[PDB]
Amino acid sequence: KNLVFQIGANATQQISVNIEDMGADALGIKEADGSIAALHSVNDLDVTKFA
Amino acid sequence: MRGQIRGLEMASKNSQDGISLIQTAEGALTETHAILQRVRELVVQAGNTGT
């Protein structure tokens, strides 16, 4: 879904932009690892496992 | 002479008629062109403003 912006009055004069952030997007090791690297942002591992 | 004179009178007539045809098509193509300007406006907008 390339965030293209055609600006130039001439053809192909486009800008390519990237969106990738969200709540589940935290430590992008490569993708979401699992309980770590993304789901601490989502699930918040500090419950009692921390204690 | 008179044969040619009269033929030149009808020649002027025919040429003026030529002009009438010309300017008819001319003004029509001018309007066509103006549309095409609007079209290209809509092409640049139909860059989707990108996405």
Distance between CA atoms of residues B44 and A14, nearest Å: 11
Based on its alpha-carbon atoms, the radius of gyration of chain A, rounded to whole angstroms, reads 18
Q: Running DSSP on this structure, what letter comes out for residue A9?
A: S
* Whole-number Cα distances in Å, A46 to A40, B40, B41: 8, 58, 56
Residue A2's φ and ψ, nearest 5 degrees, are -45, 120
Q: Which two tokens stand for residue B21?
A: 């045809």
Distance between CA atoms of residues A1 and A10, nearest Å: 22
Which amino acid, residue B36? L
Q: Running DSSP on this structure, what letter comes out for residue A30?
A: S
> Cβ contact (<8 Å) for A14 and B47?
yes
> Going along chain B, which residue ranges are E strands?
none
The residues, any chain, with a CB within 8 Å of residue A23's CB and separated by 6 or more, are A41, A42
> Cβ contact (<8 Å) for B51 and A5?
yes
User: Mutate which of B37, B40, B44 to test chain A, going by most A C-beta atoms within 10 A?
Assistant: B44
Which experiment gave this structure? Answer: cryo-EM
